[PDB]
Amino acid sequence: EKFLVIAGPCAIESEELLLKVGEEIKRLSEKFKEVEFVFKSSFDKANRSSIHSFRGHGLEYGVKALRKVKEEFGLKITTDIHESWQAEPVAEVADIIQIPAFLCRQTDLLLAAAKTGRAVNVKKGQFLAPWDTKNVVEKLKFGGAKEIYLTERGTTFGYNNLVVDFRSLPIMKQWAKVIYDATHSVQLPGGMREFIFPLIRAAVAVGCDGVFMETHPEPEKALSDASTQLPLSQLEGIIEAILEIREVASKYYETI
Amino acid sequence: EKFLVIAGPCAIESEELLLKVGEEIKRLSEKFKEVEFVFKSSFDKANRSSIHSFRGHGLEYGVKALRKVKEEFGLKITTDIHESWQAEPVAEVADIIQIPAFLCRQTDLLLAAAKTGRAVNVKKGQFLAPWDTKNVVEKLKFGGAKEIYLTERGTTFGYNNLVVDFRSLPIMKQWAKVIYDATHSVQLPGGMREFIFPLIRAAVAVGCDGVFMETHPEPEKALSDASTQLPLSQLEGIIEAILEIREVASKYYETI
Amino acid sequence: EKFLVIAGPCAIESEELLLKVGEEIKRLSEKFKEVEFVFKSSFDKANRSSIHSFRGHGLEYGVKALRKVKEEFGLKITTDIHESWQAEPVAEVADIIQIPAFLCRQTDLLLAAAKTGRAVNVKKGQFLAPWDTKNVVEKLKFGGAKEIYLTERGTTFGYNNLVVDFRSLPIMKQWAKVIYDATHSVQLPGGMREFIFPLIRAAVAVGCDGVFMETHPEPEKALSDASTQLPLSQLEGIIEAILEIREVASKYYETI
Amino acid sequence: EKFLVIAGPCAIESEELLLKVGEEIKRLSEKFKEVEFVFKSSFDKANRSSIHSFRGHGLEYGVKALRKVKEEFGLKITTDIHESWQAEPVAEVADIIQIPAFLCRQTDLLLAAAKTGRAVNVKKGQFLAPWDTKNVVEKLKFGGAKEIYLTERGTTFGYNNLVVDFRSLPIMKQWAKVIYDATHSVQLPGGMREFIFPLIRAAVAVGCDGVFMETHPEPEKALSDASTQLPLSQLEGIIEAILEIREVASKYYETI
């Protein structure tokens, strides 16, 4: 099956930033034809820890910038919603509607996304056990979702730390396609970037249906997740690496 | 102020149920004049695990039932909101607006609640560290809130289990009044009731500004948190118990 | 039943140190006649993190110093063993043989202690679940132990941190007398002392059969656990406090 | 050096069993010349949960059986010690002395093992953080050890569960060769086998110096770790699989 690579800048800092990253993702989509790329970027960081941190330039501006990426590069789009009313307007551009990790249990948000007819990708809450996602998928199917993804992005492990329990990949695969979030899994809520590559190698070795990676031309200047966003120049190499490891490991992937 | 006791049935199964519980809380209110009682009940269980579980009768029916309790018994009210638009209509009756644990980082919800001018009680997310709540308080203050509470309700401890780290009480006290949720702290996400009383005794021994307890005439028949809701008949005894323990222990509560 | 207070300097830094602390413990035993005091001090810190840290002056010297405390003050004694061969010589002076937390599953060590005829107190391993202690007690009974204690000293919670799950007290009480370790529970393996008092208040409010507290005339100069040992001058006040909280809470202690 | 594969039956149920497994490991040894095989089996399960569980036939019978394996198949040997006095007699046959996870902080055991001049493999305690292993290595070096291994076997994650934090592999590599224990990492202290292969694939994808795997002709009849021991017949396939994954992934292993 075609491997999914969801990548892009964490937040829509500007339409310019989006086009710069989109240009590269487009180039890679022409090279890695066996991969289905989906451009990701949040129009709003609605859950920052601090009231003083960057949130975004609004829904309107964001959807407009994303529409530009899709129009200029012909790339599929995904962005996250935070309240039910956002599903409809976002669905006009987003091929995949993303559900934030803290909101993976909010029934109305999941239902709002499901009825748009668009694909839905739910970030597994840091408080959720792998088997607890069966009901999340059930809600989505109940709401009309026909293409569902579950994203592994780490689990609460003590204070200000997350651990990736890779047993979650084969467990969640029982009821949905599985995506591994390579950048949020190494973040320290409220010794990070150095683990992005090794853990993503682990993910494809275990087996998943895609990977999610935030990338920015200059991470140190990013207005969000400056500590975990992958330098854009490193994207091509990481992708080639995971495709290689996926290929050699693939014959051993267990059947669900 | 005086010790706060937030109690009531988990969900508004019917205003009839609210009246029955309100009557008992009213009585206790007259018996323990040194305690400030606040009647609690959710008009919607917006985060149930299963799509087939009870959610409620809607915001309108709920606010109406809560109005009936306040008018008929002169009791302060508190209920939780799940999306920003709900803050205003709920504030019409709620003296304290409650913010769900999973939603404690949603900036707009916090701001929406703070804008109503009402007091705000934020349930500490199971993924949050005690010190990470300082930023939560700051968002509310920025939003104009002046009466702010933080509620301890357990922290993710492995899968399908929560642990109460009592160190959180003195830590959170540095920036807000602290409430201990005696019923949700012992629930196993996705042997419970036997630990409610023991842990509530610990909470007052350590020191807090109030306690939160869901109570129902017949917990076994409750449509929500049936396994953890306290039988109404046992409420008086537990309240008297914590007041006695508090009276003695308060002598040793650390400053700030 | 007579409450147990196990206290003393973490390590036997010198026989002099022991006599100084013993003198105070003796004074308190004359005042708090409802408490059974047991003087504690390790002849060897066999599990320090660093090879460069203080361990002790040997078994011989330690047993001799402890015998002096018992002889001069008439106080019961307890110390921990690390290998089976130490049970016999230690049993000559120790009224209670202590089993280290990391060694709570070593069958031969538990058996060696049990056959001495002395009481045995097992520190619950940081890796052990409360219900997992039933088998620990079974081994001891199998080995002839007639007086058994289980000590709560925290559970692994993320890296370099421990949490006290107070549900462990009533659970372990099902098969043994329960002791709460007030000083090791707040240590950060490999923001500490300020939590000793509040957590011990929680322990007696929930209900336990005794408390364990390391105390040193000048903690900052201690050769071990300098961050958690309680200043000797503060011991009397803490003990009075827990006896008061125990008394008022006692009528609510659940029957096992 | 070459990739290390430590394999064998959990416990020495009989030297007969050891010979049968040794024969298969010998064969694979001749098939994969690029791999250094080490036969493992414990002469005593000194930390079983229950007093009524299988421990073994003693140190003498065990060392004799292990001798038979080395003599008959020319295979290197490894077994674990539980008390200091055992290091010397065990070193007579063991090329690698194994230190139990619960005992990774017992200074005398580590020193005793290091004194034999043999290589030492320390199982990382379920309570230890990856960086806390630096001090473990230092103890062994101080004791004269020169060939040191650290084995990843899971970390305490809530009650009766272990999680493998793969970030530990690159961290521990800073001061010792790293081995991944594929069978104990999925055991539930106090759905297991299905995760052995997936996680071992992750381990080599991330990068380690070897893998540890308990194997038995008929796991269902094993007297120890029956639920996690790999059927002997499946050993060849898994080894070939990890060698192929390692071959491809090694290109991306980070330096130090």
Side-chain angles (χ1 to χ4, degrees), chain D residues 73-172:
Chain D
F73 303 116
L75 289 171
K76 282 193 175 182
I77 301 293
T78 184
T79 194
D80 54 330
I81 58 176
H82 315 94
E83 284 194 344
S84 300
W85 64 273
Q86 309 184 325
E88 189 184 307
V90 167
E92 310 280 59
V93 188
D95 292 280
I96 301 179
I97 292 179
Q98 194 182 107
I99 298 292
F102 295 156
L103 312 182
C104 67
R105 267 233 228 156
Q106 303 308 298
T107 309
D108 292 328
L109 190 65
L110 293 167
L111 294 178
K115 179 185 293 298
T116 68
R118 296 294 192 173
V120 183
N121 179 197
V122 186
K123 292 298 203 67
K124 179 165 57 59
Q126 300 88 327
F127 47 82
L128 226 58
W131 38 86
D132 307 323
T133 62
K134 184 184 177 184
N135 278 165
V136 175
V137 176
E138 176 177 52
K139 286 186 184 173
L140 290 172
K141 284 187 173 185
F142 175 81
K146 299 205 76 295
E147 196 178 313
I148 303 167
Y149 303 89
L150 289 177
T151 298
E152 168 58 50
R153 54 94 73 239
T155 304
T156 294
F157 185 64
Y159 297 133
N160 307 294
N161 199 186
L162 296 173
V163 62
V164 179
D165 180 359
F166 285 91
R167 288 176 299 187
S168 78
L169 271 53
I171 296 179
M172 298 192 289

Side-chain angles (χ1 to χ4, degrees), chain B residues 14-28:
Chain B
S14 65
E15 78 157 49
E16 176 180 59
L17 171 68
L18 304 196
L19 295 182
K20 194 177 194 65
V21 177
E23 173 173 291
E24 178 53 31
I25 288 181
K26 175 58 179 182
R27 185 179 74 76
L28 266 29

Side-chain angles (χ1 to χ4, degrees), chain A:
Chain A
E1 194 60 56
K2 198 170 183 185
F3 198 68
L4 205 72
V5 169
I6 296 168
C10 175
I12 299 179
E13 284 163 29
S14 69
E15 187 170 299
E16 187 186 308
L17 170 64
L18 261 45
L19 295 178
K20 189 177 182 182
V21 180
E23 183 171 59
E24 176 63 356
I25 292 179
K26 179 58 176 181
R27 183 178 76 79
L28 299 182
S29 70
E30 290 304 326
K31 179 180 181 182
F32 303 120
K33 288 179 160 57
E34 73 273 59
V35 170
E36 178 184 305
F37 288 85
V38 182
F39 186 95
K40 183 277 179 180
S41 198
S42 306
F43 62 78
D44 182 39
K45 306 312 295 184
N47 70 159
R48 297 306 298 270
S49 300
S50 175
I51 186 66
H52 301 111
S53 298
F54 177 73
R55 287 190 59 178
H57 297 114
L59 186 290
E60 184 178 65
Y61 180 91
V63 173
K64 180 170 168 291
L66 289 166
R67 178 176 285 104
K68 185 55 183 176
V69 172
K70 172 179 286 188
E71 174 188 301
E72 197 177 317
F73 302 111
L75 271 39
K76 287 193 173 182
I77 298 289
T78 180
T79 193
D80 51 337
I81 56 175
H82 316 85
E83 285 189 349
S84 299
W85 68 269
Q86 307 179 326
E88 193 185 321
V90 171
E92 282 187 287
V93 65
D95 295 275
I96 304 184
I97 296 178
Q98 180 176 124
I99 301 299
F102 295 151
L103 313 179
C104 65
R105 270 237 227 155
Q106 302 310 296
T107 304
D108 291 331
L109 190 68
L110 291 168
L111 256 31
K115 69 184 66 169
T116 65
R118 296 298 208 173
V120 184
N121 176 28
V122 185
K123 292 297 206 67
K124 175 166 57 64
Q126 302 90 325
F127 47 81
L128 222 53
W131 40 86
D132 299 334
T133 58
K134 186 181 181 179
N135 282 334
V136 176
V137 176
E138 194 187 22
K139 292 189 186 180
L140 284 176
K141 285 188 178 183
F142 180 94
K146 288 161 289 183
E147 196 177 77
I148 305 167
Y149 302 85
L150 288 174
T151 296
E152 165 62 49
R153 52 96 71 240
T155 304
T156 295
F157 186 70
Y159 298 129
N160 309 292
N161 198 189
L162 297 172
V163 63
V164 177
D165 182 355
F166 287 93
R167 289 174 300 187
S168 84
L169 271 50
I171 292 175
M172 303 193 286
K173 178 56 174 178
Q174 288 173 293
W175 40 72
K177 290 175 183 177
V178 180
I179 302 299
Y180 172 64
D181 187 325
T183 45
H184 289 108
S185 296
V186 302
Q187 89 195 324
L188 304 178
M192 291 184 263
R193 184 166 301 175
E194 75 195 78
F195 300 117
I196 293 175
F197 198 7
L199 293 190
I200 201 177
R201 295 202 293 277
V204 292
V206 169
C208 55
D209 304 292
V211 296
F212 172 109
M213 306 182 274
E214 303 199 313
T215 183
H216 190 293
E218 312 177 69
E220 57 176 57
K221 298 178 182 175
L223 310 186
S224 64
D225 281 332
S227 303
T228 59
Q229 296 205 66
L230 187 80
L232 184 57
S233 61
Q234 290 179 50
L235 192 62
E236 165 171 30
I238 297 294
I239 295 175
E240 169 68 19
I242 51 186
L243 291 172
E244 296 178 357
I245 300 174
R246 171 170 175 258
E247 182 63 37
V248 68
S250 66
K251 67 184 293 178
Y252 302 112
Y253 289 165
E254 294 73 12
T255 302
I256 49 179

